[PDB]
Amino acid sequence: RIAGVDIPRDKRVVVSLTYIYGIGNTTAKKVLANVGVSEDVRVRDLTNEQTDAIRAEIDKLKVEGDLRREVNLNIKRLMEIGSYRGIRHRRGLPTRGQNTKNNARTRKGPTKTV
Amino acid sequence: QVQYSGTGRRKNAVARVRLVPGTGKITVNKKDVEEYIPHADLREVINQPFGVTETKGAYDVIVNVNGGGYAGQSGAIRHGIARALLQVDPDFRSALKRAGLLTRDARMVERKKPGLKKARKASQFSKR
Amino acid sequence: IRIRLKAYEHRILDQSADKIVETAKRTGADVSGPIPLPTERSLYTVIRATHKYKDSREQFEMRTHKRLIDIVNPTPKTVDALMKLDLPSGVNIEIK
Amino acid sequence: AKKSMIAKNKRPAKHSTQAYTRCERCGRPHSVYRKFHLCRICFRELAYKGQIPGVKKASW
Amino acid sequence: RSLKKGPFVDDHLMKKVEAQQGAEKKKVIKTWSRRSTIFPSFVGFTIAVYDGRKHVPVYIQEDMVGHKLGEFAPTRTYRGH
Amino acid sequence: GQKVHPIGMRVGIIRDWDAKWYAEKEYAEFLHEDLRIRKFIATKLADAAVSTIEIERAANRVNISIHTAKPGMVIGKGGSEVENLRKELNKLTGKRVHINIVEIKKPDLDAKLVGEGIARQLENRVAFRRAQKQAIQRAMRAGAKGIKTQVSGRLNGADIARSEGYSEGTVPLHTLRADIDYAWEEADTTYGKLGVKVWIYRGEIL
Amino acid sequence: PRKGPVAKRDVLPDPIYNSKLVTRLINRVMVDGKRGIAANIIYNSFDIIKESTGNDPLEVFEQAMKNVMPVLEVKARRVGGSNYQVPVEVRPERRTTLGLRWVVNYARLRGEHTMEERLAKEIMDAANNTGASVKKREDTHKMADANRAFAHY
RNA sequence: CGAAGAACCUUACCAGGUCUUGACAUCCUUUGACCACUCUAGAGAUAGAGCUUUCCCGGGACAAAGUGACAGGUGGUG
RNA sequence: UAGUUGGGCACUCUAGCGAGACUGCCGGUGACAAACCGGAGGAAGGUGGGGAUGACGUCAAAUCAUCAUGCCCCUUAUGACCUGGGCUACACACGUGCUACAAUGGGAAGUACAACGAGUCGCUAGACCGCGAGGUCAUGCAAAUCUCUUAAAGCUUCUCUCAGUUCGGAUUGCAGGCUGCAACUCGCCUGCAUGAAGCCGGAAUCGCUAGUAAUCGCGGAUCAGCACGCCGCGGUGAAUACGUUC
Ligand SMILES: [K+]
Ligand SMILES: [Mg+2]
Ligand SMILES: [Mg+2]
Ligand SMILES: [Mg+2]
Ligand SMILES: [Mg+2]
Ligand SMILES: [Mg+2]
Ligand SMILES: [Mg+2]
Ligand SMILES: [Mg+2]
Ligand SMILES: [Mg+2]
Ligand SMILES: [Zn+2]
């Protein structure tokens, strides 16, 4: 559709572009402002010229594939050099200096009562 | 010219009131009451005394309010009007004292206390 | 002149303010009454125990009372008497 | 270990963050009020004795 | 420093490294400064950092410049339960 | 249960705080100066019947008021003692000092000196019941409305600690309008420490 | 409590309809002291009732309360090795409390998009004897009649 | 919960590098000043020098040694 | 332009001195009692509401680590100094909290009403820059004079319309800001991007009877910097109590 994702149709433009891996509300509003359209229309009521301008600015911006490659290469770099911050990833632990005693389920995954 | 003053208080709020002959308007700090109190539930609370004693279309009201929130201020205005109507006519006291409007509501805020996380609330006791 | 008195005990503060007012009326000047500014209480809470007993506590209070005096028609007599005079150490005084 | 800790206090600190409060009567050192330079414990004692000006029991 | 000012580094470490101008790797240097940054000058040396109990070595490469020294000298020998 | 210190309970209502000065920025300096002064006097004049200290401050001056039952001892022969005292106090404070001695009337009703004497007797290994009853006699003769004592420690080299005291008359601690005095005094014996609590009920304020 | 009954503070009427049920229902549906939101919800719901029905919203609500208010509670009693229920003639205030409680709870349980709509539909269903609140009424009465044998207790 | 603030300090624990009338005291034996500061190093503690000795009014708190009496222990027994 | 300026303190407010409430009065019941019941009046009626206030002693309850202290123990070291590390780990279990799981709601805009309290190398107005956190200049204030401080919930609109969603916000990457010699172990905040679990929770169990619960924010102590905690403050503001079978 735009960058490899068939976005919704009953949704409005900003909130439907939020479903791209790299675009939130702020950048969506910035893009629609740079293009000069209405932010409160629904994408099943667009002119294809507006769609094309949207696609152009999105391609100018860094999105799904490049974004995954960039973040993952960063992670792989810090894992392969052997930093603490990458050992956290390699071990499945939190990374921002949190306490790993009574919490950290979002990295530990499921609990294992032992 | 003629003025019938009162001073009402309710829940950390104060209302300096003066009744003057008029039609039934209630100014509140250079603002209308239906703009100052957006709730229609409390303008009736204010106009209770005029419902007790038939004085509704008699007096415009002028108020200087301070402290509290909208409902404490409404009760303050209620109390102040009930006071000023005695300067007007003490014969209305026989009905105001049955309404309980001279009764200054002493329902004030309770202390917070140490060991308790709030006034009468306590932390969850665990037997073990 | 404006004089700010402040203390921890109104029972002494009032006596001292009366002393000031009487010295002023003696030296022949007009003064505002000693008008009271708001007290200020600094609260303090302390664990009533020495170790690990945390729910039982004790609340101390440092209240400061404070009075304000004006002097309208300062005679040199007035300005000299109200700078010669001494007071207890509980009260404290600041002029102008 | 104690009283060398008080020596460390009263000696000049290398850095401004290495300066830390201390009771001045007991060296607790936690629970200190800057207005008094006193632990809560000695504060309570001396307030009972009356040796702290202005303080008293509180209730409202 | 997360303030757009001097990228922090210790004076003695800077001094010894800059004295090591020929960039010989045998010129291995030690430090207790886990808090300093890394610079391009460091890129290619085998520095030994005090991890609380030992001087653990580490060889620097390009992928460490924005990082600290203590990140490559952990202090907790966790091995599972 | 645990009790509240009576003097602490009754500050403001019945008693004025003993450090009768005021300051904001030099508050802590003045207070710890007062404490150093009290410690120095307690160390020096332990032989004297020092009971109550008061300190006032006035613009680089330190007025002091010392209650004592043996003033002749503290003043010395027509002086010659307070001078050395204020010399040392000026050395400590770094400022000028003035002293007013007060002669304690009825020292057997002041709670601190009773405790000092009882603790000295107990250090001299006198019977604790004897000491308590004797002090109670002395006070209730001197004109008390009531008195109460409490000694607690290793009494007569015991293997177990306990607390034993007696009382004559009234000690309404929960009544604030009381002029109750209280005193703690510690005795350092070979077997350890003993604690002498005294509290005395004088006539009250209305 | 051990010391006998307690007399409760009186009820404040409603400003527009001059009723006590309305204000007490405001207090019921209220959450976190929000009389304004609760009252707006109720007045808009009764506006819907006025819209879809010519009868007075207050009269429709009276009819619903007549159709939901029970007459007989079940009260629990533990006779040694068996705890069982007992029918109980319900006091007239308890009747109204249970009525408002049932109405409001099953209303907010209803699966519509606004509490306004939920409450209005629930009240109309109750006035026509079709609602979950009326099911609850029927259940309590059927249990009272099924345990009617303990009239002596 | 002591903790009314675990980056250093705190911190009492661990590794390494250091000292032993001692970091903190009183009593003594110096013909008296020495703190502070600049550099060399050093992770720093610490030593090497220099800037310095100006102790103050026999006395007065401070700097050294030297003298051992002693200090010191958040070391146990609540 | 603004209580502004003049004037006045009248009302408020401040804070001292006082009054007031004591079954004090009316009737009923009661041993002619104490007392209870209601009533009147009064701001308030029955210890008005709350607090400080913790008897003999019990738990050989806790505290030798706040402090002091007997005895024992080390005293070329269990003492002392420095740096770095650790108290922040992580298969897991528990307690106390915060956020939530939504439309009584999310988001954008506008707008209204508090109190307590803190402030000198500290609170900082106003102006400018910055998406923002914040930065530059610079004024007032040792303070009812200035500031923190236009509080948030609330109210009126618009939009979202049932959805793991515009919910939820975790976690993670990137850029920055502050503090401070130094923010990796190990700080707080912001922006961008991702967008997990979670659709009201088993057995069981906790708090609360009125300005309470519930919810909403505000300040302060510690503090160079940092708390979802602690202490206090006020805003909005319920339901129920038949009764002692258990
Ligand atoms: K802070
Ligand atoms: Mg953390
Ligand atoms: Mg509250
Ligand atoms: Mg540390
Ligand atoms: Mg009592
Ligand atoms: Mg134990
Ligand atoms: Mg911990
Ligand atoms: Mg959201
Ligand atoms: Mg109760
Ligand atoms: Zn202390």
Automatic annotation (TrEMBL), chain B:
Keyword Manganese assigned: no
InterPro entries: Ribosomal_Su5_D2-typ_SF, Ribosomal_uS9, Ribosomal_uS9_bac/plastid, Ribosomal_uS9_CS, Ribsml_uS5_D2-typ_fold_subgr
Gene3D superfamilies assigned to the protein according to its UniProt record, in alphabetical order: 3.30.230.10
Cellular compartments per GO CC: cytosolic small ribosomal subunit
A GO BP entry: translation
GO molecular function annotation: RNA binding; structural constituent of ribosome
Family of the protein in this entry: Belongs to the universal ribosomal protein uS9 family.
HAMAP family, per the entry: Ribosomal_uS9_B
Stated name of the protein: Small ribosomal subunit protein uS9
Organism: Enterococcus faecalis (Streptococcus faecalis)
UniProtKB/TrEMBL annotation, chain C:
Superkingdom per UniProt: Bacteria
Key words, A-Z: Ribonucleoprotein, Ribosomal protein
Single GO MF descriptor: tRNA binding
Domain named Small ribosomal subunit protein uS10: residues: 2-96
GO cellular component assignments: ribonucleoprotein complex; ribosome
GO biological process: translation
A Pfam family that the UniProt record links to this protein: Ribosomal_S10
InterPro entries, per database record: Ribosomal_uS10, Ribosomal_uS10_CS, Ribosomal_uS10_dom, Ribosomal_uS10_dom_sf
PANTHER family (alphabetical): 30S RIBOSOMAL PROTEIN S10 FAMILY MEMBER
Function: Involved in the binding of tRNA to the ribosomes.
Subunit structure: Part of the 30S ribosomal subunit.
NCBIfam families, per database record: PRK00596.1 (NF001861), rpsJ_bact (TIGR01049)
Family affiliation: Belongs to the universal ribosomal protein uS10 family.
This protein's name: Small ribosomal subunit protein uS10
Origin organism lineage: Bacteria, Bacillati, Bacillota, Bacilli, Lactobacillales
Originating gene: rpsJ
UniProtKB/TrEMBL annotation, chain D:
Alphabetical UniProt keywords: Metal-binding, Ribonucleoprotein, Ribosomal protein, RNA-binding, rRNA-binding, Zinc
Binding site for Zn(2+): 23, 26, 39, 42
Binding site for Zn(2+) 2: 39
Gene3D superfamilies for the chain: 30s Ribosomal Protein S14, Chain N
UniProt cofactor(s): Zn(2+)
Cofactor: how bound: Binds 1 zinc ion per subunit.
Alphabetized Pfam families for the sequence: Ribosomal_S14 (PF00253)
BP-aspect Gene Ontology terms: translation
GO molecular function: rRNA binding; structural constituent of ribosome; zinc ion binding
Binding annotation for Zn(2+) 1: 23, 26, 39, 42
GO cellular component annotations of the record: small ribosomal subunit
Record-stated family: Belongs to the universal ribosomal protein uS14 family. Zinc-binding uS14 subfamily.
Functional note: Binds 16S rRNA, required for the assembly of 30S particles and may also be responsible for determining the conformation of the 16S rRNA at the A site.
Assembly and binders: Part of the 30S ribosomal subunit. Contacts proteins S3 and S10.
Stated name of the protein: Small ribosomal subunit protein uS14
The species this protein was found in: Enterococcus faecalis
TrEMBL record, chain F:
Membrane-traversing stretches: none
Family the UniProt entry places it in: Belongs to the universal ribosomal protein uS3 family.
Gene symbol of the encoding locus: rpsC
InterPro entries: KH_dom, KH_dom-like_a/b, KH_dom_type_2, KH_sf_prok-type, Ribosomal_S3_C_sf, Ribosomal_uS3, Ribosomal_uS3_bac-typ, Ribosomal_uS3_C
Organism the protein comes from: Enterococcus faecalis (Streptococcus faecalis)
SUPFAM superfamilies documented for this protein: Prokaryotic type KH domain (KH-domain type II), Ribosomal protein S3 C-terminal domain
Entry keyword set: Ribonucleoprotein, Ribosomal protein, RNA-binding, rRNA-binding
SMART domains hit by this protein: KH (SM00322)
Subunit structure: Part of the 30S ribosomal subunit. Forms a tight complex with proteins S10 and S14.
Source superkingdom: Bacteria
Protein purpose: Binds the lower part of the 30S subunit head. Binds mRNA in the 70S ribosome, positioning it for translation.
GO biological process: translation
A cellular-component GO term for this protein: cytosolic small ribosomal subunit
NCBIfam families linked: rpsC_bact
HAMAP family xref list: Ribosomal_uS3_B
KH type-2 domain boundaries: 37-105
GO MF annotation: an example: structural constituent of ribosome
PANTHER family registered for this protein in UniProt: 30S/40S RIBOSOMAL PROTEIN S3, SMALL RIBOSOMAL SUBUNIT PROTEIN US3C
Name of the molecule in the record: Small ribosomal subunit protein uS3
